[PDB]
Coordinates of C-alpha atoms and ligand atoms in Angstrom, one line a residue:
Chain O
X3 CA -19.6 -3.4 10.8
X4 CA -17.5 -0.1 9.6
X5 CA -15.1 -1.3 7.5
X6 CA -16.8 -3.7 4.2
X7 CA -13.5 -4.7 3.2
X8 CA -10.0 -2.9 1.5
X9 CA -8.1 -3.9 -1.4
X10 CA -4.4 -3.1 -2.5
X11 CA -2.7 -3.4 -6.1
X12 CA 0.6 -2.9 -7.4
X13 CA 1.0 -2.5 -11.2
X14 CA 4.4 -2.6 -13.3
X15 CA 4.0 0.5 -15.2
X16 CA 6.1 -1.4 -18.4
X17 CA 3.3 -4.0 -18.5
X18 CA 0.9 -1.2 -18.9
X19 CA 2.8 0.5 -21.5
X20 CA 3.0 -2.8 -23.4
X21 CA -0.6 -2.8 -23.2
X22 CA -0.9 0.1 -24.8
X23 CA 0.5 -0.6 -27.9
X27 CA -7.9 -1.4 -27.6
X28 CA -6.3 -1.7 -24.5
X29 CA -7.6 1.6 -23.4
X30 CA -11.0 1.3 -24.4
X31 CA -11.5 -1.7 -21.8
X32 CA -9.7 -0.4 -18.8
X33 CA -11.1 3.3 -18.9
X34 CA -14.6 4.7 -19.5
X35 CA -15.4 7.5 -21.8
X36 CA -14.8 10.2 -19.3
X37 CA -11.4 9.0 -18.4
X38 CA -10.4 8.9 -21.8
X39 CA -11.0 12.1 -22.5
X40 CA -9.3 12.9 -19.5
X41 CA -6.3 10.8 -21.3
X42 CA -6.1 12.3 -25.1
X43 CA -4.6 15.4 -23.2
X44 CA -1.8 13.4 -21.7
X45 CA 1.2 12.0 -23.1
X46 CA 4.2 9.6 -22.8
X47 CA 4.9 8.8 -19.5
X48 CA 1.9 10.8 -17.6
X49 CA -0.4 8.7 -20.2
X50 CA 0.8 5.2 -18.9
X51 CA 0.8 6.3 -15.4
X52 CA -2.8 7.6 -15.5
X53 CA -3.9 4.2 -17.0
X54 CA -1.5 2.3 -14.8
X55 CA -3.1 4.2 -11.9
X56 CA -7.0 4.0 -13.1
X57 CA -6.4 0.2 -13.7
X58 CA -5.0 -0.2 -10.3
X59 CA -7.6 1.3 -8.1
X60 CA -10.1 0.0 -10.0
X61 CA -8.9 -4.1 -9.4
X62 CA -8.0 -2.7 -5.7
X63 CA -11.8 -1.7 -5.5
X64 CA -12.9 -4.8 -6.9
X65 CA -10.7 -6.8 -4.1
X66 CA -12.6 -3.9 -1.5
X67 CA -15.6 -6.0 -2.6
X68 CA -14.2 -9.1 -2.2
X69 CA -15.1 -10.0 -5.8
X70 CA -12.5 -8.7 -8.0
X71 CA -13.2 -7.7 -11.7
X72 CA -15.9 -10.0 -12.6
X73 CA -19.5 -10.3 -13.4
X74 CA -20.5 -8.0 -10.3
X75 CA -17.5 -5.1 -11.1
X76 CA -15.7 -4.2 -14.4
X77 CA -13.4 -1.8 -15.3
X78 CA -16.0 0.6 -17.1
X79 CA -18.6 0.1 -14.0
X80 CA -15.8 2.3 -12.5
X81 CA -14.7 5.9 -12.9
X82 CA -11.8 7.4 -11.0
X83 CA -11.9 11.2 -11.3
X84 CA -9.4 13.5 -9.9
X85 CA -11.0 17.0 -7.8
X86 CA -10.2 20.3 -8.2
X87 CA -7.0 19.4 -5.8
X88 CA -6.0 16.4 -8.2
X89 CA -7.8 14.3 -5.4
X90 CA -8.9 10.7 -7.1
X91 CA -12.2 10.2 -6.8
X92 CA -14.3 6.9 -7.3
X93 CA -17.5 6.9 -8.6
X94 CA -19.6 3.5 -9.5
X95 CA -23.3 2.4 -7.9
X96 CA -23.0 1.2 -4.4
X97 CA -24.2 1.8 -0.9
X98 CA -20.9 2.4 0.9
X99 CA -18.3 5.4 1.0
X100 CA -15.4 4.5 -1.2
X101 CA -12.2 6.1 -0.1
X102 CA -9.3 5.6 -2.3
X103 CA -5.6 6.8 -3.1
X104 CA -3.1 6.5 -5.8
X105 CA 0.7 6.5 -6.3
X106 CA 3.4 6.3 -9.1
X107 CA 7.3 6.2 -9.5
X108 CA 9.0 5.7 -12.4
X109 CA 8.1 2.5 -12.7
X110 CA 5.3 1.5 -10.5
X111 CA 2.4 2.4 -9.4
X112 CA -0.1 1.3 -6.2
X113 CA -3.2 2.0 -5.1
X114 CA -5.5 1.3 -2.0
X115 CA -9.4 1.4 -1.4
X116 CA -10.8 1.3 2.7
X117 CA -15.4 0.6 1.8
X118 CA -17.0 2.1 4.5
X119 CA -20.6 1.4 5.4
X120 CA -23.3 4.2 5.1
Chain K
X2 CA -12.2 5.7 21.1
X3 CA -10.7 4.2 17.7
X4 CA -12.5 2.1 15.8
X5 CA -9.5 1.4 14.0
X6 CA -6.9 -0.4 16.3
X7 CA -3.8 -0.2 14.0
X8 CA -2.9 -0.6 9.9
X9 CA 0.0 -2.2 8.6
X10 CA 1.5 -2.2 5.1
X11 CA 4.5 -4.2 4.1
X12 CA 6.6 -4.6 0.8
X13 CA 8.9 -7.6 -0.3
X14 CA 11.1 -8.3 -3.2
X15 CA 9.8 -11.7 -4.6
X16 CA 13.5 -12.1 -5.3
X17 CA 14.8 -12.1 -1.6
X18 CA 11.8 -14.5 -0.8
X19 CA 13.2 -17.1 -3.9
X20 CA 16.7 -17.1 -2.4
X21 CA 15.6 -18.1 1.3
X22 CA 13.4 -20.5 -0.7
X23 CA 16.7 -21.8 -1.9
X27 CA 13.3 -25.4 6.2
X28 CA 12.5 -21.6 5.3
X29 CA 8.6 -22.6 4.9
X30 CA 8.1 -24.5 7.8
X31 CA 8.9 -21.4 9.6
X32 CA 6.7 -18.8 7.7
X33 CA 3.7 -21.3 6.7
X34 CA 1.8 -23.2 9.1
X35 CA 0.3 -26.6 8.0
X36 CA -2.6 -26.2 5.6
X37 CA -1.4 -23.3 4.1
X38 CA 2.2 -25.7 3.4
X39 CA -0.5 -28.3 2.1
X40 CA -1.5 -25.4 -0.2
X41 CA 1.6 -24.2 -1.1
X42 CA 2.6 -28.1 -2.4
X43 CA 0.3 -27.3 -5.5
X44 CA 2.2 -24.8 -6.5
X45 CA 5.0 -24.0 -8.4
X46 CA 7.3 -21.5 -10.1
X47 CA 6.8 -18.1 -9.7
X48 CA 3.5 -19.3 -8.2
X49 CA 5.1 -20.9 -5.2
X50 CA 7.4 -17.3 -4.7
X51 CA 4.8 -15.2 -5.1
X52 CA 2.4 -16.8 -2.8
X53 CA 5.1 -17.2 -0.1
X54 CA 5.7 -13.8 -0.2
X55 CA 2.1 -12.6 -0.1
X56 CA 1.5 -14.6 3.1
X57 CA 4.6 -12.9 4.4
X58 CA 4.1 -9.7 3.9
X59 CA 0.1 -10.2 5.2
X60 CA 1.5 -11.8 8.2
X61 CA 4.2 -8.9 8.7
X62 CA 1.8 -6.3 7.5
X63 CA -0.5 -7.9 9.9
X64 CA 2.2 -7.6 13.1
X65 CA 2.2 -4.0 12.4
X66 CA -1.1 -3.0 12.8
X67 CA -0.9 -4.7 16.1
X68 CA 2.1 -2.6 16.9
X69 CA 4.7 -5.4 18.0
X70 CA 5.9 -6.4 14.5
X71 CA 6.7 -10.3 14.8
X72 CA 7.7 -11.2 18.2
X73 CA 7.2 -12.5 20.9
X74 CA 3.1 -11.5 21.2
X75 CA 2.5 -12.4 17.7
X76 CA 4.9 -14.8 15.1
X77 CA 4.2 -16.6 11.5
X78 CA 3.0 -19.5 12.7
X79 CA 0.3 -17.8 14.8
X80 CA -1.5 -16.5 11.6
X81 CA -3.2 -18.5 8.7
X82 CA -4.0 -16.9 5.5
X83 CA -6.8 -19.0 3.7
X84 CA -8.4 -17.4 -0.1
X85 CA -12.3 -17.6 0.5
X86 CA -14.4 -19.4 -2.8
X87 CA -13.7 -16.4 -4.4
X88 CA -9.6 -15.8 -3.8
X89 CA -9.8 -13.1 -1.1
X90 CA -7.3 -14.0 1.8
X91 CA -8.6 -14.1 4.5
X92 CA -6.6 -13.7 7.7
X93 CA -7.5 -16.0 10.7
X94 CA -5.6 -15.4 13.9
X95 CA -6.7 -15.6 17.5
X96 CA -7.8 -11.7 18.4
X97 CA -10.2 -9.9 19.4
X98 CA -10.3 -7.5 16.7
X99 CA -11.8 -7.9 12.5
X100 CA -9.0 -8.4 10.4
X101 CA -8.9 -6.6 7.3
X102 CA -6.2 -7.7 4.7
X103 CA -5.1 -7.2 0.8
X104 CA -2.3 -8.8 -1.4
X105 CA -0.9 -8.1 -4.4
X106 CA 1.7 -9.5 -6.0
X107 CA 3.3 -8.1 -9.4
X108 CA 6.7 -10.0 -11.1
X109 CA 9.0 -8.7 -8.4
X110 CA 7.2 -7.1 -5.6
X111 CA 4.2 -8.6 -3.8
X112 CA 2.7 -5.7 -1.1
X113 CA 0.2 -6.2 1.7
X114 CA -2.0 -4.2 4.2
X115 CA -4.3 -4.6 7.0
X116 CA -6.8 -2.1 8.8
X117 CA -7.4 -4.1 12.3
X118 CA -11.0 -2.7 13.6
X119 CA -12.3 -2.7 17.0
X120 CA -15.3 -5.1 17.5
X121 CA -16.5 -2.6 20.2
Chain G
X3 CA -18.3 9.6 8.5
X4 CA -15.9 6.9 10.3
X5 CA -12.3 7.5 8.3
X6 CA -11.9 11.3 6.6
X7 CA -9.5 10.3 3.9
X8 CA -7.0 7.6 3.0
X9 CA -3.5 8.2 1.5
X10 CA -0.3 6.0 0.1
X11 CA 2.4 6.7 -1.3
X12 CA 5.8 4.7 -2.9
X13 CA 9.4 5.9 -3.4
X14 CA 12.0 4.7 -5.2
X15 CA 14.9 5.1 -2.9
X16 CA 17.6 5.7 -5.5
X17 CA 15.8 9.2 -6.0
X18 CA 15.6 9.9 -2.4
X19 CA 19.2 8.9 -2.0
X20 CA 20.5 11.5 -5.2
X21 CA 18.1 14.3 -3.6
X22 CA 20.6 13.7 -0.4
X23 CA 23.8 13.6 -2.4
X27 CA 19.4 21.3 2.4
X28 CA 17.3 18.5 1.2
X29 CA 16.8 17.0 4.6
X30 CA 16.3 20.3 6.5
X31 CA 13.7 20.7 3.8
X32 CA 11.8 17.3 4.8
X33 CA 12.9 16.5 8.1
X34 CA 12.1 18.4 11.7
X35 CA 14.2 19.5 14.4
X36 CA 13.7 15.6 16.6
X37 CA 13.8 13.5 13.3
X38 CA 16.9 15.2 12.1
X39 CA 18.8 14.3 15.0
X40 CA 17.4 10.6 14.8
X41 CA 18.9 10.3 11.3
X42 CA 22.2 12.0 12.4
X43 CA 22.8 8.5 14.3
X44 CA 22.1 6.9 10.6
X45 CA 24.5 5.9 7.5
X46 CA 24.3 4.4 4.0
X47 CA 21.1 2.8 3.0
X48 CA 19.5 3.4 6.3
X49 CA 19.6 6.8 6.5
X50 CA 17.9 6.5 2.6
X51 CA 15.5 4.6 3.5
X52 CA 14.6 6.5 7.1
X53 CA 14.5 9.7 5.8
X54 CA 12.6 7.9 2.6
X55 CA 9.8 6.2 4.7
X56 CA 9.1 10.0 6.1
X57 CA 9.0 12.0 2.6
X58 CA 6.3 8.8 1.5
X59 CA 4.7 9.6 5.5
X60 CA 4.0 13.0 5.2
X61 CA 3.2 12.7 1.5
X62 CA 1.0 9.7 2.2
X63 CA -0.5 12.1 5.1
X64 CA -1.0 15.0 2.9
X65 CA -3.3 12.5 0.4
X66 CA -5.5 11.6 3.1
X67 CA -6.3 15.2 4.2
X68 CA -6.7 15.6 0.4
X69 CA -4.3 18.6 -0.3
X70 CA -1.3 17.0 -1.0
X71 CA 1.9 18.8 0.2
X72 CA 1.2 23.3 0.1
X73 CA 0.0 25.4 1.9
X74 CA -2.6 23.6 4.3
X75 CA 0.3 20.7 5.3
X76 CA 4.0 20.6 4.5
X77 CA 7.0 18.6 5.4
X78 CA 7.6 20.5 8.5
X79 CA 4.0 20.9 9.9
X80 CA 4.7 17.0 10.3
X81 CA 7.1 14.7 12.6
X82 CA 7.1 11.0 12.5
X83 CA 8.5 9.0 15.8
X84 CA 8.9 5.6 16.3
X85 CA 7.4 4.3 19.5
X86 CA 9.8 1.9 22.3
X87 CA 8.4 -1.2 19.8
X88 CA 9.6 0.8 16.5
X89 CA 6.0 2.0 15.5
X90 CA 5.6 5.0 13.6
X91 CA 3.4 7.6 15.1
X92 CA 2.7 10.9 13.4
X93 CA 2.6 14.1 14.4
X94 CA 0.7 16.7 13.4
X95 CA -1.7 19.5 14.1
X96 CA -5.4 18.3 14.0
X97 CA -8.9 17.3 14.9
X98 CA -8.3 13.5 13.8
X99 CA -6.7 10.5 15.1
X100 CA -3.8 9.6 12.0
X101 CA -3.0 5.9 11.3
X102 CA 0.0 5.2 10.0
X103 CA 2.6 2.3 8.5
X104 CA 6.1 2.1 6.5
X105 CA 7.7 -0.6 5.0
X106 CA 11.3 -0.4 2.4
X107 CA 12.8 -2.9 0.7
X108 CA 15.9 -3.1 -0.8
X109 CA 15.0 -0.4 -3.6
X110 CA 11.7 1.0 -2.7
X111 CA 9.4 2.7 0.4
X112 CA 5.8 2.8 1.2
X113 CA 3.8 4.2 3.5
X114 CA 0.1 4.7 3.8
X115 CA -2.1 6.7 6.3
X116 CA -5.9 6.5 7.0
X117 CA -7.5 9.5 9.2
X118 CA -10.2 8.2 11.6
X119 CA -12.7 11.1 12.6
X120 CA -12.8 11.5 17.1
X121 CA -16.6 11.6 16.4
Ligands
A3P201 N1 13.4 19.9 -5.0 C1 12.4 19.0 -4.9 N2 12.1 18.4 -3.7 C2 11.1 17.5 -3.6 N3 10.3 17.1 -4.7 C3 10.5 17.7 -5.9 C4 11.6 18.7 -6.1 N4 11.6 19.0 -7.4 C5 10.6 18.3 -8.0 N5 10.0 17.5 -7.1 C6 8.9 16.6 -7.4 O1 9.2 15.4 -8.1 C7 8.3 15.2 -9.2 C8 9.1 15.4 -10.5 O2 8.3 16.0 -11.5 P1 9.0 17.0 -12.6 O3 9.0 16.2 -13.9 O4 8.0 18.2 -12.7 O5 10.4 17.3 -12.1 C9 7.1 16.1 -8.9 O6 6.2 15.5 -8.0 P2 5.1 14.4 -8.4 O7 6.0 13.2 -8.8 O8 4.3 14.1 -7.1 O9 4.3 15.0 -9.4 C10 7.8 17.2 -8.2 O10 6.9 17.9 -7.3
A3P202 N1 6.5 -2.6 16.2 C1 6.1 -2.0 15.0 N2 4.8 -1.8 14.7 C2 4.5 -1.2 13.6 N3 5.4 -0.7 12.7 C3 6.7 -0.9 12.9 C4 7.2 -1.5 14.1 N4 8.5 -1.5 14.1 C5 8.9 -0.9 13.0 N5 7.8 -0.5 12.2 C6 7.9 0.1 10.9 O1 8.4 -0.8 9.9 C7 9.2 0.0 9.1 C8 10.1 -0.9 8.3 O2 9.3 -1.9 7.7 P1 10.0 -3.1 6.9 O3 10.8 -3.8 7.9 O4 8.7 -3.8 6.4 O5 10.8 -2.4 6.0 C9 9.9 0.9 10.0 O6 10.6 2.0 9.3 P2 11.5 3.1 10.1 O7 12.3 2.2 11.1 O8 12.2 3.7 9.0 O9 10.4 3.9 10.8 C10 8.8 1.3 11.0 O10 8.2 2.6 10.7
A3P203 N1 -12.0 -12.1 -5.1 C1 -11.0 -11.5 -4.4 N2 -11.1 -10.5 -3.6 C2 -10.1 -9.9 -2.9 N3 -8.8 -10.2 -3.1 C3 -8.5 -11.2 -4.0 C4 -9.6 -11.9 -4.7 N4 -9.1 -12.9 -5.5 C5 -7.7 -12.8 -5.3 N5 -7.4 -11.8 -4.4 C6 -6.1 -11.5 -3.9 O1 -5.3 -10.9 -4.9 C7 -4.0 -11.4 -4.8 C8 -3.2 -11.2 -6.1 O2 -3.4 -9.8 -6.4 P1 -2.8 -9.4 -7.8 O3 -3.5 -10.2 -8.9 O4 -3.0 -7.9 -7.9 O5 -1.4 -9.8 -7.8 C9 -4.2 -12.9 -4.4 O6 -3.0 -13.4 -3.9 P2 -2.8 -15.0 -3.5 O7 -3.5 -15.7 -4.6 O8 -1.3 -15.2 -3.4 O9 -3.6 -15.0 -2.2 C10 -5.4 -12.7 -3.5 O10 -5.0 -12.7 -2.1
A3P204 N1 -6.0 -8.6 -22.1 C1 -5.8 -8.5 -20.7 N2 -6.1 -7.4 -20.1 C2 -5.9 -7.3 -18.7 N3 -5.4 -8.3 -18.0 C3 -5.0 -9.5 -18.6 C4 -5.2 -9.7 -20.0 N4 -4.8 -10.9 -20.3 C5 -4.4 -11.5 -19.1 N5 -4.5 -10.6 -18.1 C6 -4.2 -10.8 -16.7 O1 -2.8 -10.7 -16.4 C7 -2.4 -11.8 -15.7 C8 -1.7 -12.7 -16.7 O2 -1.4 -14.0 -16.3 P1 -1.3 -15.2 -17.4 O3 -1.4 -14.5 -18.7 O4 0.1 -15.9 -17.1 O5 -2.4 -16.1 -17.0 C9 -3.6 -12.4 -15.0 O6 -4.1 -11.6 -13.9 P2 -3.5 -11.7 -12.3 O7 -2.1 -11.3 -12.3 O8 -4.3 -10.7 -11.6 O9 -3.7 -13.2 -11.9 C10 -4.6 -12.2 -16.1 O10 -6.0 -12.1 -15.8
A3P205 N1 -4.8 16.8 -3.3 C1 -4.7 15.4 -3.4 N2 -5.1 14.6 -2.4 C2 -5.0 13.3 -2.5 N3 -4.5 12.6 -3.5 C3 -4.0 13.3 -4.6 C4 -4.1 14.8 -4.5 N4 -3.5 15.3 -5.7 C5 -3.1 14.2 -6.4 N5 -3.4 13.0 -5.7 C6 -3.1 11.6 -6.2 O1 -1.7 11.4 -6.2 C7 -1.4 10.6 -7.4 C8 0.1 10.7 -7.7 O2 0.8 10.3 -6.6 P1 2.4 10.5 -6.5 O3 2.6 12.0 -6.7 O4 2.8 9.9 -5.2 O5 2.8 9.7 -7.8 C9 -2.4 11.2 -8.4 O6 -2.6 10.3 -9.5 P2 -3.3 10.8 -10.9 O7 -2.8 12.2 -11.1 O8 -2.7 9.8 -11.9 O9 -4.8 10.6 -10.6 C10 -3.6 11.5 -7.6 O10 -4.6 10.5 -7.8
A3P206 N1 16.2 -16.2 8.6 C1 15.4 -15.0 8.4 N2 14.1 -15.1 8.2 C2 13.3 -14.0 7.9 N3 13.8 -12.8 8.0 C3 15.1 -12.6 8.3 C4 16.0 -13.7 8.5 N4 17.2 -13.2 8.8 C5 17.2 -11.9 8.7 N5 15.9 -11.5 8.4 C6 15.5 -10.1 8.3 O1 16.2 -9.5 7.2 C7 16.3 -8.1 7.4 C8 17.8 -7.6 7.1 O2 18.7 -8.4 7.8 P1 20.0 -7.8 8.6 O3 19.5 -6.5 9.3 O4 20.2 -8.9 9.6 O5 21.0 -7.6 7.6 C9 15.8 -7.8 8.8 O6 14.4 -7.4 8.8 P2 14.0 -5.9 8.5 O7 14.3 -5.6 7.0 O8 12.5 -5.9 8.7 O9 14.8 -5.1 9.5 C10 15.9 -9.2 9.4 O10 14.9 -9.3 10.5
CL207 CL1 2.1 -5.8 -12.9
CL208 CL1 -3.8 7.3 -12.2
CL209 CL1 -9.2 -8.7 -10.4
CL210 CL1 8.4 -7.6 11.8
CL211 CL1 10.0 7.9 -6.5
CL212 CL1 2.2 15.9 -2.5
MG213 MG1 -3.0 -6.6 -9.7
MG214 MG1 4.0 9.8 -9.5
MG215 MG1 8.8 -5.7 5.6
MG216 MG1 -5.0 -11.0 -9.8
MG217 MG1 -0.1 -11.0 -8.8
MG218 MG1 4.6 10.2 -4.3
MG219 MG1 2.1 14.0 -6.6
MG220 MG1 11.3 -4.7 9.8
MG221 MG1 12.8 -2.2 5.4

């Protein structure tokens, strides 16, 4: 049993931008938004559109979506020193993740492996 | 020796799925998941339509023949476990893996087929 | 240490199709150039889109991203007799790969499986 489960997501980057006008403070943890006072505009709404996505698609990996189990600040995607996302939250199993983003959309995708 | 037979991925635009709903279901649901798509309605009814499409499709890719003559809609039920994850139940030998998502105008789903051996 | 990396990408193909209005000797090999010479209108946007999201896709799951370790060219992406896409590349791991466009946009997504 390698694979535990993988989830998808597709977010309208408008609805997150609408969103955003505390929004924030429920979708990203402290470290992220930190991360996020930097950015701006565009490269603001696509960082929370992004964070929000891989976050539900980890919570579909589980098979639970975001519920009592997994929330949003459980959850903290980081980026590596080659903008890699990371995802970091207490489980047994090797979370591999990855993030996109157009103009106006944005996806991402999370495979749990067993450890 | 793999462990990973194939992956698929597939895109629609909810839109195109609406039209052909304007019999188009007969063809792409099989009989309970009709029974479940009576219960809907609206963008509901679209939306779900298109995420069993694109799960099937996505899911003919990962074998590698797209839908044909090896593998076709009607072959493949998508049921949502107690807790809404679709599940994908298809005669194989392989674990299915699968994942929908469905925003106002796209829906977008992906499989990882793993060997069971 | 099953799968080393995953990676997924989306296009819009409207951006793809005003890079091509050079650009595809910059993002298409040799073989795959002559493929899309055969190809016109929206299908030669959305071929030559479904390899730029490929590669890119590909270059997520080694974890670089397009540079210096993996670009455009390093990479070729075939269709088998059944129209599957099957990358090619230089390395140590089996690549898994899919594509799908609609009308206006392209995804792909790769996951690298360790032989080991
Ligand atoms: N000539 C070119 N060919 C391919 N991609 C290009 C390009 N010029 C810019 N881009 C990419 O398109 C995006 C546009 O960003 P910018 O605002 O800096 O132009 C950037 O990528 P990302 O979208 O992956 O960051 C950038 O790398
Ligand atoms: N038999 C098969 N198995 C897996 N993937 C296939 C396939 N035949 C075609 N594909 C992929 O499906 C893509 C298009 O998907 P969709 O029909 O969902 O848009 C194709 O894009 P290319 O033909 O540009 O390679 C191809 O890569
Ligand atoms: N607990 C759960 N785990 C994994 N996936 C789930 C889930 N509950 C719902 N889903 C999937 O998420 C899909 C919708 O995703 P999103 O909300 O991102 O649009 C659902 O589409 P269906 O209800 O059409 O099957 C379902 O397949
Ligand atoms: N304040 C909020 N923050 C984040 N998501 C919300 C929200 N309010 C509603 N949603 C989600 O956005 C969708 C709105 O649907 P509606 O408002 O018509 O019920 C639902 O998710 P799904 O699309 O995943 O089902 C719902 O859970
Ligand atoms: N070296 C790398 N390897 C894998 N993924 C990377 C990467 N550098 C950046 N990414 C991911 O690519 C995303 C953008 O994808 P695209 O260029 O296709 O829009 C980034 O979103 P964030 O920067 O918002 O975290 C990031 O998560
Ligand atoms: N009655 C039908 N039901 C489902 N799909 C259909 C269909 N008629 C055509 N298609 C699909 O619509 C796409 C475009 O149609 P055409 O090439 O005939 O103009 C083709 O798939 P792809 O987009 O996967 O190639 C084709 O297979
Ligand atoms: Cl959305
Ligand atoms: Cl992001
Ligand atoms: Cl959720
Ligand atoms: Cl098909
Ligand atoms: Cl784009
Ligand atoms: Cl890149
Ligand atoms: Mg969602
Ligand atoms: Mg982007
Ligand atoms: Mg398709
Ligand atoms: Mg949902
Ligand atoms: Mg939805
Ligand atoms: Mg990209
Ligand atoms: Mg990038
Ligand atoms: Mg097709
Ligand atoms: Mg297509």
């Amino acid at each position: 049993a390698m694979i535990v489960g993988i989830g998808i997501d597709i977010i309208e980057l408008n609805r997150i931008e609408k969103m955003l006008d505390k929004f924030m403070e429920r979708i990203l943890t402290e470290n992220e938004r930190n991360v996020a006072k930097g950015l701006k505009g565009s490269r603001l709404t696509e960082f929370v559109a992004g964070r929000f996505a891989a976050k539900e698609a980890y919570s579909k990996a589980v098979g639970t979506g975001i519920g009592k189990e997994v929330s949003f600040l459980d959850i903290e995607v980081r980026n590596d020193d080659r903008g890699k996302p990371i995802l970091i939250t207490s489980t047994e199993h090797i979370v591999h993740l990855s993030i996109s983003h157009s103009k106006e959309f944005a996806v991402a995708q999370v495979v749990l492996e067993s450890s």
